[PDB]
Amino acid sequence: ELYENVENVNVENKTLRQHYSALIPNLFIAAVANISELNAADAEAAAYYLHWDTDLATNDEDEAYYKAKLDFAIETYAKILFNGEVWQEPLAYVQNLDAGARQEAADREAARAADEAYRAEQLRIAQEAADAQKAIAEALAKEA
Amino acid sequence: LDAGARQEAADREAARAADEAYRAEQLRIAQEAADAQKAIAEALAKEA
């Protein structure tokens, strides 16, 4: 979408699109890792839909559940760091550059308009008071 | 880079002109009101 767009501005010795282009190997590695883990999870859930190693001896079978919950939590906490370091923050940086550019353009325009309006208001008030003084002058000139 | 250079030159000139005009307007309004007060002073000096 930034093909010859008015929003494709210069930031950090480059334009906006070059950062997005450089984001490619990060996304590649992240996708490969996520795909491998998803394949492993798919195989695990498919091969043990109805198996002994899932409905164990006692009805309780709580120790295995808690061990699995521990392993799952360890994996999730490791994945938070992995995903945050590989692709989330490189993308967030570019998106913040985008948002900052739009915001600075917007409030620059707003500040320009506000300054113009404030100057016009001051000038019109001063001139209108000047004509009020003019009325005073003509009145007390006419009385005498 | 080209477009930014031209735009910054243009609005720099525009801002300079606007500031000069605004200063001149303020000064002329203040001085003209000063002469209005001058008319007040001479009128109420002449009445008495």
Add this chain to the structure above:
Amino acid sequence: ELYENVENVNVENKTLRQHYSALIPNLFIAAVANISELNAADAEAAAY
């Protein structure tokens, strides 16, 4: 907590979270040293 937060801003060619992530090996070395000294102190106070 800075996951897609309004406070995750850009500073020094990076965002806020990358500094925290880079803080990891420092904390690792510090913890290893402190743990070794605490183990030595524990053994000393227990054996005497």
Add this chain to the structure above:
Amino acid sequence: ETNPTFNITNGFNDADGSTIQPVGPVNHTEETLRDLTDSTGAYLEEFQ
């Protein structure tokens, strides 16, 4: 417009699975869960 999908917006959002979710006990069968997972697995198969 801009691309705010992965920054600023509600730091904890239900749209991505980052918000918290209170759970009571409700029985959804193994078949129901397998159907719900295969529904998205169909979409992800081409990538997979």
Add this chain to the structure above:
Amino acid sequence: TITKTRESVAYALKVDQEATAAFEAYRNALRDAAISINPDGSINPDTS
């Protein structure tokens, strides 16, 4: 889907704990039937 799969596990483990508690209570009653033990820790021939 995440929330629903969580709710399902919440139901399953709850019924599992209830079953374990009931089995423990009923086996304890059966054990107490043969040789009853007083609260102080002695056999009670009256109710054994």
Add this chain to the structure above:
Amino acid sequence: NGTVEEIVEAYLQVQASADGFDPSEQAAYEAFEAARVRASQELAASAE
């Protein structure tokens, strides 16, 4: 002297959390905040 599993077990209450692990980042945030508060109280205890 523990291992990684023991560390995550003890300081973040894995078993005491809502049944069915919440993979939400908010859950991790609350767990780490609770661990921080506990360590903060232990620090004042050691100070005294």
